[PDB]
């Protein structure tokens, strides 16, 4: 039985980058050929492994992390990057063994008047550790006076929305991203 | 004749932060008392000069730089700051002699459905030098292939709009900012 790469790549709805969606793939035959013939991906970049020798090695688990970001910040998905989507939403380790795949989804994620269902974390006290997610919506104390959940002056709500519309530039349109991290440990 | 501080502070429309508006005030009696009684300012911070001894010193020119930013980035208007409004839109020197004044203008700059007339520069090749403005709208080559004004993939339009609406948080609402820099040179 082939590993499911049509329920991760061809799914109906993707998760926001702050609450990204991790799926552990195991106990199957990893048929990555589905990613070699697909001509929609705008980025297929492999770190650690060669992008054609993914079949040769046998791994314990393959974690597919899927989310939706903008076109400007697809480059922030890589080892040793900084930004708003690289230390507050999704952080990759400095020694990463996996592959990042990103393709334009303006025709799925952008509706008339704006699709404000895709949020991203703008404020956070400290940078994320690799492969950590934060789904908290607590008020960010950006000043010097405790907020206690009122969201006023110098107390901002962290989760800012994405203004995706079909008229945006190709660099401001929604890109769907899937990060396949290959995890190998001492086990079958 | 009192120096004009009602055509800078009480003007009808403010300029965007990227194309900020500089007015040189000279040949008048600097009556800063209008700024001591005004109770609307949320920030009145003076660097170099004491905020009450502004009358005692006699300066050659007073440059009032007015613009509109968001509430999150009013703190980026200060000597030795970094961000998107501190090295791409408006940069203050490390040895600054002046005063920054900022007040909330949600009831003037935010209309129903959004006031997208206030732009800010998001992309730039190099950081601004102190007291420099850039009003160019050339396409930003963020990739490795020259754009030549097409605005496609990895070629972004720098000027991004502000989504000001009356429902935003007090930290996401439009703040009007006026920076009075005191310039003294050997002259009357």
């Amino acid at each position, epitope marked *: 039985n082939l590993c499911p790469f049509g329920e991760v790549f061809d799914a109906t709805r993707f998760a926001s980058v702050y609450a990204w969606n991790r799926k552990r793939i195991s106990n199957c035959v990893a048929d990555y050929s589905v990613l070699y013939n697909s001509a929609s991906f705008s980025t*297929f*970049k*492999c770190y650690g*492994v060669s*992008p054609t020798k993914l079949n040769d090695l046998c791994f314990f688990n393959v974690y597919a992390d899927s989310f939706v970001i903008r076109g400007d910040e697809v480059r922030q998905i890589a*080892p040793g990057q900084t930004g708003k989507i690289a230390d507050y939403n999704y952080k990759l380790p400095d020694d990463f063994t996996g592959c*990042v795949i990103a393709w334009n989804s303006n025709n799925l994620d952008s509706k008339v008047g704006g699709n404000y269902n895709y949020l991203y974390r703008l404020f956070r006290k400290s940078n994320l550790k690799p492969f950590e997610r934060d789904i908290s919506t607590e008020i960010y104390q950006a000043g010097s006076t405790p907020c206690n959940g009122v969201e006023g002056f110098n107390c901002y709500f962290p989760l800012q929305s994405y203004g995706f519309q079909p008229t945006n530039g190709v660099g401001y349109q929604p890109y769907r991203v899937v990060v396949l991290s290959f995890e190998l440990l001492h086990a079958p | 004749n009192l120096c004009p501080f009602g055509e800078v502070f009480d003007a009808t429309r403010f300029a965007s932060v990227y194309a900020w508006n500089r007015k040189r005030i000279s040949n008048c009696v600097a009556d800063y008392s209008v700024l001591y009684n005004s109770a609307s300012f949320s920030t009145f911070k003076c660097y170099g000069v004491s905020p009450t001894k502004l009358n005692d010193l006699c300066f050659f020119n007073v440059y009032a730089d007015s613009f509109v930013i968001r509430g999150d980035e009013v703190r980026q208007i200060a000597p030795g700051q970094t961000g998107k409004i501190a090295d791409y839109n408006y940069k203050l020197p490390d040895d600054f002699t002046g005063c920054v004044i900022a007040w909330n203008s949600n009831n003037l700059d935010s209309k129903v459905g959004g006031n997208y007339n206030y732009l800010y520069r998001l992309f730039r090749k190099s950081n601004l030098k102190p007291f420099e403005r850039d009003i160019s709208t050339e396409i930003y080559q963020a990739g490795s*292939t020259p754009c030549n004004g097409v605005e496609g993939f*990895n070629c972004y339009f720098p000027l991004q709009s502000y989504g000001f609406q009356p429902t935003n948080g007090v930290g996401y609402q439009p703040y009007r900012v006026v920076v009075l820099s005191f310039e003294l040179l050997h002259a009357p």
Partner: nanobody
Amino acid sequence: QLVESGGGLVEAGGSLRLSCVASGLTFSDYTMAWFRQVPGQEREFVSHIGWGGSETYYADSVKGRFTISRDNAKNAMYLQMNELKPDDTAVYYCAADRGSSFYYVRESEYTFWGQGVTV
């Protein structure tokens, strides 16, 4: 960032050796490539070499002629050209990216880029 050397008028049948040194990166985690651009046409792809050096790819017009290689003891890569027909005179760019793409032909898959070589 990416300095490069070599290039110049040849005797149309001899050899040449372009080289590309990196001066701000580890060069042990960076996959390198060589592109070529002629004025009046898009930038072509010359060759590509992943980490270590055992994984090399060449264009379908310079296969067999050019030899790509890399040396980590001085942070350099080399494109040894051996035929130099009168149709490959162009600017030659050196590119380096942290990862190894399946579309190694695409110039958008390389973050850092070097200067240009003589035409």
